[PDB]
Structure formats: structure tokens, C-alpha cells
Amino acid sequence: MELIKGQALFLELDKKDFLSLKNNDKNIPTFAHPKNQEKILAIFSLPYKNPPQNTKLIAFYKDKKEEIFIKTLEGNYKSEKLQVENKKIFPPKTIQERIAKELKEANAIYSSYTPKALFNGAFNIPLNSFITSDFGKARTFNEKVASYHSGTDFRAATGTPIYAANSGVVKIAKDRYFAGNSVVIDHGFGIYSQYYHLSKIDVKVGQKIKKGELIGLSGASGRVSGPALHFGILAGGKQVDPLDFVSKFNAIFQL
Ligand SMILES: [Zn+2]
């Protein structure tokens, strides 16, 4: 198989006698295929930055092992060269400490796997607008990726209602550095949707939210280039192309 860096793929496996799916010593969780009782699914994601050239997964069964090889593709992302090199910034301590603390909190959430579906059918887009900055736009130094856009930006004047892309449980609902006023929703199976730069947050941590329910108003909080909605998806432990993920997910789970 082949997979572009920064995208997710739904792996299909036989359910009968399946025991576990491993990359190296890391276990990959599985869930039911909604349409074929004899199959299960797993989400495999490649990181955008510094992905391996090739991946070998192993599905262990009661009396056989199945090897799955995935070649990494560079894709056709937009990219521009940086001419500074030292993307090493020097924030003051108070900002450094806040960034570190919010990173620890987020990583605990994104690795807290919910082994059931909290979603309800297909994902919807969180507002009926258009993309102004696509996922995966990169800045490179000597053909090494220094940074990239980890979600997709929708056009939105300040105060535009933002709706949950699918049902789930709110895990983050506060102002964070970089992300500004942020909402993050657990949809189950390690799938998280992200809504950044809001001007108003209308949900609370722990709230059960339904697909299409208001979660806040768009804004420009934490955003340099003016008002917009930044929409992200994390799945298989990595940020992935959100519109690509939604298309692949909906092809399987569509109502
Ligand atoms: Zn963005």
C-alpha cells in the first residue's frame, strides 16, 4: 500500500482469530467494520514531519501473522523555502511554561483512547464556508520540513456560528497559546476534532455534544492573520489532512 505523509488510512482486516495489530512494539487498536461483520478496521496515520520511508505492520492471528507494508509518499503539498534556519525562538519563561503545560495536557488527551463510537454517522463540515488555507502547507530549510499547517482554515468573519463536525465528548474548552480559544472533541476510536481561534466558547469540558450542535463563535483569538476558523483532525495519534480524513471516514460510516 501507499500513503501520503500526514494522511490517515483505514486498514481492513479479517476479524476471525485476530489477536493484535502492531507497528513495532506499539499496539494499534481496532474497531468493527460497520458494514461487514467479518472485518475490523484500524486507523494508521503517517506524521507530516520526518515520516519513515516505509512501514511494516504485523497483524497477529491465532496461528498466522499478516505483514502489511506501507510506502510513504511525499504528496503534492504547497511548500515555501525559509531563509533564516534558526526557527528556534526564545520565548520568555512565563510563555515557555504555559506552552509546556498545555502540551502535556493535550498529549494526555490525544493518547486517551475511547474504545467505542461517540460519533453518529458521517462527519459534517463545522460551517458552510470555504477553505482559505489548506492543510499541509509547509516551510522548508534545505528540503527539511521546519513547520507545516496542521489543520485547514475556513473563511469566517468574527462571530460566525461553529457547529460540531460529529457527536462526541468535549475534552478541551479554553484559551491556549497558539490555538487561542479552543474546543477539542473526542469522537471515539482515537479520533479528535479541533476548532481553534474562537471568539466565544459555548461548551464545557465533559459535555456530550451532538453532530451539528453549536460549539462556539468563530473569531481571531490566538491568530495573527485575522479572523478564521482553524479546523483540525487528530487520528491514529497524529494530525492528519482533515478533509481527506472526513472523506475516508464518511465512505465507511455514512448513515
Ligand atoms: Zn490554521
Numbering used by the authors: 20 to 274
What does the published report state?
This enzyme turns over the cell-wall peptidoglycan by both the d,d-endopeptidase and d,d-carboxypeptidase activities, as documented by mass spectrometric characterization of the requisite reactions with synthetic cell-wall fragments. The Pgp3 monomer is structurally divided into four regions: the N-terminal domain (NTD, residues 21–95), a flexible linker (residues 96–147), the LytM domain (residues 148–259), and the C-terminal helix (residues 260–273).
We decided to mutate His216 and His247 individually to alanine in order to abrogate the binding of tartrate or citrate at the active site and impair catalysis too. Because Wat-1 and Wat-2 were essentially equidistant from Zn2+ (2.9 Å and 2.7 Å, respectively), we could not establish which should be the hydrolytic-water molecule. The distance between Wat-1 and Zn2+ decreases from 2.7 Å in the uncomplexed H247A variant to 2.6 Å in the complexed one.
